[PDB]
Amino acid sequence: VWVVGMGIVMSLIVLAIVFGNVLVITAIAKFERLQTVTNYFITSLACADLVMGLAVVPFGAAHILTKTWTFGNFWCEFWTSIDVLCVTASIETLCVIAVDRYFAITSPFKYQSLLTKNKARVIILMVWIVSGLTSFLPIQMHWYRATHQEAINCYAEETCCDFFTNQAYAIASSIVSFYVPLVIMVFVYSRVFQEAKRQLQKIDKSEGRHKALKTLGIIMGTFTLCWLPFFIVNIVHVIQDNLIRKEVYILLNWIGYVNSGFNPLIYCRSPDFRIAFQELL
């Protein structure tokens, strides 16, 4: 009786993700006032979220609700390659957002001419290619496979498609896709908050007669709660095999998948954007 118990939520999630992504993309597309150097970065985020939601989630639902795929093996590798690429692209885009916000706040005088409209696009390219260097190239090679006899019936046979990783690839992907962005964001937002506190103290000193905490905390809480637990167990299993079970791993991956739907509300709020949404429909 759980056939409809689990799966309707998946349909709701995918529909919500698609609807959220398409509105942001068309709002950037069709209105002139929205275009800016910052919005170009969010455009890649929206496109990547739309691609991932349209690609990996609906097919993953079939794998969840049935024993295994009715599909091919190269398609299994293709799905596994798309998922990691999407996740790492999202992480890198968020890191770039934090960096450019820091450049804006800290040194306004040089910011106006630091980031030209043209050169900005270049950095986005330097994101995706880097992601590709960890997404398609190692998956198509033998690095995705494992040496242990268990799951050989998965990699070297047709029906099974579950994920199995060698020791090196898991830790390398975790180091290159999660921890470096986090160690960037923590320090950079600490500096931004210190600057904001200093400014508020100066304003209070000027004229006798907390927004920043909430504003940064919503984003930090959403991101850290969404993605941190997965990349602990990701290192752990590979480090030690006995501890974890598969279903918990899948659930922690899925709760991270929800971040794609969760993000646009946190990372997109402006009166101009509100007017643009109001104009549509």
| Rounded distance between C-alpha atoms, residue 207 and residue 164, angstroms | 62
Residue 262: which of 225, 216, 231, 228 has the closest Cα? 225
Residue 233: which of 244, 242, 222 has the closest Cα? 244
90 lines the binding site for ligand G1I (CB under 6 A): no
Tell me the three state secondary structure of residue 231: helix
Q: Which residues contact 98 (CB under 8 A, 6 or more apart)?
A: 184, 185, 188, 189
48 lines the binding site for ligand G1I (CB under 6 A): no
CB 248, min distance to ligand G1I, A: 14
80 lines the binding site for ligand G1I (CB under 6 A): yes
| Rounded distance between C-alpha atoms, residue 108 and residue 183, angstroms | 24
CB 170, min distance to ligand G1I, A: 6
CB 253, min distance to ligand G1I, A: 5
Q: In the set 45, 48, 57, 84, which binds ligand G1I (CB under 6 A)?
A: 84
Q: Is 234 annotated as a binding residue?
A: yes
146 lines the binding site for ligand G1I (CB under 6 A): no
83 lines the binding site for ligand G1I (CB under 6 A): yes
Tell me the three state secondary structure of residue 163: coil
CB 234, min distance to ligand G1I, A: 6
Residues that bind ligand G1I (CB under 6 A): 80, 83-84, 87, 163, 170, 173, 177, 253
